[PDB]
Amino acid sequence: QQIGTLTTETHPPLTWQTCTSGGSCTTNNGKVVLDANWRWLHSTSGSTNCYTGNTWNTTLCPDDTTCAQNCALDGADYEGTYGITASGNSLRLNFVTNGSQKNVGSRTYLMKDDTHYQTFNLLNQEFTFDVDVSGLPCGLNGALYMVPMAADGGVSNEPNNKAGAQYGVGYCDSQCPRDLKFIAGSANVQGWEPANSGLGGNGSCCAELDIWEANSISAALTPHSADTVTQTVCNGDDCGGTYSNDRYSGTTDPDGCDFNSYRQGDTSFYGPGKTVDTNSKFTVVTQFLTDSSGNLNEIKRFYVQNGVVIPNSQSTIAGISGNSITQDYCTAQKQVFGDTNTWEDHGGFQSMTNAFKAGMVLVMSLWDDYYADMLWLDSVAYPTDADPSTPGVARGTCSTTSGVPSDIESSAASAYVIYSNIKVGPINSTFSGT
Numbered sequence: 504q505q506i507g508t509l510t511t512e513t514h515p516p517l518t519w520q521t522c523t524s525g526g527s528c529t530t531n532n533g534k535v536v537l538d539a540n541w542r543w544l545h546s547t548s549g550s551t552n553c554y555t556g557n558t559w560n561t562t563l564c565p566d567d568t569t570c571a572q573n574c575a576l577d578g579a580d581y582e583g584t585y586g587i588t589a590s591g592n593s594l595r596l597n598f599v600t601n602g603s604q605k606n607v608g609s610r611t612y613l614m615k616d617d618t619h620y621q622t623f624n625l626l627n628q629e630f631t632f633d634v635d636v637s638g639l640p641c642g643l644n645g646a647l648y649m650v651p652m653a654a655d656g657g658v659s660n661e662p663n664n665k666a667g668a669q670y671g672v673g674y675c676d677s678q679c680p681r682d683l684k685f686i687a688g689s690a691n692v693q694g695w696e697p698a699n700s701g702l703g704g705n706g707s708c709c710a711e712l713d714i715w716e717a718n719s720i721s722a723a724l725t726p727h728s729a730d731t732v733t734q735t736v737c738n739g740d741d742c743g744g745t746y747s748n749d750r751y752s753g754t755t756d757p758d759g760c761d762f763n764s765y766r767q768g769d770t771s772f773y774g775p776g777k778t779v780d781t782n783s784k785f786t787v788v789t790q791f792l793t794d795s796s797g798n799l800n801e802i803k804r805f806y807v808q809n810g811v812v813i814p815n816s817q818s819t820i821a822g823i824s825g826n827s828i829t830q831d832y833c834t835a836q837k838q839v840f841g842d843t844n845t846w847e848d849h850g851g852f853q854s855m856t857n858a859f860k861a862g863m864v865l866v867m868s869l870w871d872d873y874y875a876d877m878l879w880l881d882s883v884a885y886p887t888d889a890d891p892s893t894p895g896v897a898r899g900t901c902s903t904t905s906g907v908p909s910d911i912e913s914s915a916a917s918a919y920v921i922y923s924n925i926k927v928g929p930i931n932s933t934f935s936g937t
C-alpha cells in the first residue's frame with residue numbers, strides 16, 4: 504500500500520516505562536498507530552475509493568499487485584472518527600464512534616518512532632499495565648497482546664509497501680486472518696468474498712501472545728504457537744484458524760494454551776464485585792520465566808488492586824492444578840478438557856521463545872466477535888449447546904444468546920476500555936503492595 508497525502512498522520516503520544524529490578528522506572532515517549540484496515544484507502548491520483556463498505560473497486564484493484572500500486576492508506580482522525588484518545592500514560596478506545604459514519608472498535612500498535620513499531624523481548628521480564636474494564640459488558644473484548652510483526656511494517660522487502668508501520672501495516676496473528684486488505688506487500692482483493700469485512704484469498708499468519716483478552720465478566724491469558732513465528736502468507740482454507748472450514752489444518756495454533764480463572768474452576772476470582780473487582784481499575788502483571796537455557800517455561804500472572812498483590816487463582820479442575828501457564832499445565836488442560844493440543848504441535852513454549860527473540864509488537868484493541876459472539880471468553884457454555892458440567896465448557900456468566908454484534912453495537916454503544924501505566928522490566932520490578 505501507498506502513503507496517502509490527503510490527511511496528515513499524527514500518531515497520538517503514549518508514554519510507557521522501563522523499570523530496574525528495584526522498582527525505579529523511566530519514561531519512554533512512544534506513540535500509537537491505527538491499524539491499516541480501519542483507514543481510508545483511495546487512489547494515489549485523488550479521492551476515489553479503492554475499497555468501500557465491504558467491496559473493492561476492481562478498476563483500481565483488478566489484482567493484488569496492481570491494487571497495492573494504485574492504492575494509498577491515508578491519515579486518521581484518531582478521536583473524531585475512531586474514538587481513540589491518548590493522554591499521558593493512558594490510551595482509551597471507544598467501542599462505537601458516531602463521526603461522519605459509524606465506526607466500531609479499533610486496533611492500535613505501540614510505536615518507537617513514526618516509521619517503526621516498538622519491539623519487545625520479554626524473556627525473564629514482566630509486562631505490567633493498569634486497565635479499566637468496568638465499561639465492557641458481555642460480548643466485548645479489550646485485548647492487549649503481542650505479535651511478531653515486522654518492526655518497519657514490511658517496507659524493507661515489499662516494494663509495493665510504502666505505508667508500513669507509519670500507517671499500521673503488517674498485521675498477522677494465530678488465526679491467519681483473511682479479512683486483511685494488505686498482506687505482505689500485496690492487496691488481498693483476489694478471492695475477496697464479502698462476509699465492513701470479507702475474506703480474501705490469503706491470510707496473514709504468525710505466533711501470538713494474548714497477554715490480556717477481557718471484559719468485566721471474564722479474562723483470559725493465552726499464548727499461541729506457530730511453525731514460523733513471524734509473518735507467513737497462507738492459501739484460503741489451508742490457512743486454518745477462524746476463517747477456515749478446517750480450523751486445525753494450518754501452520755499456527757488457533758486455540759492457544761489459555762488460563763481463564765473461571766474456565767479453570769474458580770468463579771469467585773475475577774468479575775464484578777469479585778476478588779479482582781472489575782467495577783474498578785486494577786493492575787495486571789504478566790511474568791515470562793525461563794528454564795536454565797533461557798527458553799520460556801512459565802507465564803505467571805499477578806493482579807494489584809487497592810494496593811493489595813493478588814496471586815492468580817489456582818485451577819481447581821481435577822487433573823489441572825497450579826495458577827500459571829507451564830508445559831505441565833498445558834498438557835493437562837488439553838487432555839482434561841479434550842481440546843486438540845495445537846499449542847504443543849506448533850512448538851509450544853519454544854515457539855513463544857522464538858517469537859520473543861524475533862521481537863514482539865504491542866497491540867491494543869477493542870472489538871466484538873462476528874464469529875462466536877465472544878462466547879469462548881465469557882459464556883456459561885461454549886459451545887453454547889455443551890454441558891457446563893463438562894470441564895472447560897463454562898468460561899463466564901454471560902448467557903448463550905449474549906454478544907451478538909448487531910445487538911451489542913446498539914445496547915453497549917457507550918462501551919470503552921482504558922489501558923494505562925504500561926511498565927516493562929525484570930521480574931518483580933514493576934509492582935508492589937501488601
Ligand SMILES: *[C@@H]1O[C@H](CO)[C@@H](O[C@@H]2O[C@H](CO)[C@@H](O[C@@H]3O[C@H](CO)[C@@H](O)[C@H](O)[C@@H]3O)[C@H](O)[C@H]2NC(C)=O)[C@H](O)[C@H]1NC(C)=O
Binds near residue numbers: 694703704705
Ligand atoms: C494466496 O491466495 C491465492 C488465491 O487467491 C493462492 O493462489 C493459488 O495458488 C495455488 C498454488 O500456486 C494455485 O493452485 C494450482 O494452480 C495451478 C494452475 O495455475 C495448478 O497447475 C496446480 O496444480 C494447482 O492446482 C492456484 O491456481 C492459485 N489461485 C489463484 C487464483 O491464483 C496462493 O497460493 C496464496 N498464497 C500463499 C502464499 O498461500
Ligand SMILES: OC[C@H]1O[C@@H](S[C@H]2[C@H](O)[C@@H](O)[C@H](S[C@H]3[C@H](O)[C@@H](O)[C@H](O)O[C@@H]3CO)O[C@@H]2CO)[C@H](O)[C@@H](O)[C@@H]1O
Binds near residue numbers: 680682699868869
Ligand atoms: O468496522 C471497522 C473496520 O473493520 C475492518 S475488518 C475488522 C473487523 O470488522 C473486526 O471485527 C476485526 S476485530 C479483530 C481485532 O481487532 C483483533 O484484535 C483480534 O485479534 O481479531 C479480531 C477479529 O479479526 O478486525 C478486522 C480487521 O482486522 C474493515 O476492513 C474496515 O473497513 C472497518 O473500518
Ligand SMILES: OC[C@H]1O[C@@H](S[C@H]2[C@H](O)[C@@H](O)[C@H](S[C@H]3[C@H](O)[C@@H](O)[C@H](O)O[C@@H]3CO)O[C@@H]2CO)[C@H](O)[C@@H](O)[C@@H]1O
Binds near residue numbers: 680758842
Ligand atoms: O484473537 C483474535 C481472534 O480471536 C478469535 S476467538 C478464539 C480464541 O482466540 C481461541 O483461544 C479460542 S480456542 C477455543 C476453541 O475454539 C474451543 O473449541 C474450545 O472448546 O475452547 C477453546 C478455548 O476458548 O477460540 C476462539 C474462537 O475462535 C476470534 O473468533 C477471531 O475472529 C479473532 O481473530
Ligand SMILES: *[C@@H]1O[C@H](CO)[C@@H](O)[C@H](O)[C@H]1NC(C)=O
Binds near residue numbers: 546553561562563
Ligand atoms: C472506481 O475507480 C475508477 C477509477 O478511478 C472510477 O472511475 C470509478 O468511479 C470508481 N468507482 C467506485 C464505485 O469507486
Ligand SMILES: *[C@@H]1O[C@H](CO)[C@@H](O)[C@H](O)[C@H]1NC(C)=O
Binds near residue numbers: 930931
Ligand atoms: C517475586 O515475587 C513473587 C510474589 O511474591 C515471589 O513469589 C517470587 O519468588 C519473587 N521472584 C523473584 C525473582 O524474586
Ligand SMILES: [Mg+2]
Binds near residue numbers: 690693704
Ligand atoms: Mg492474494
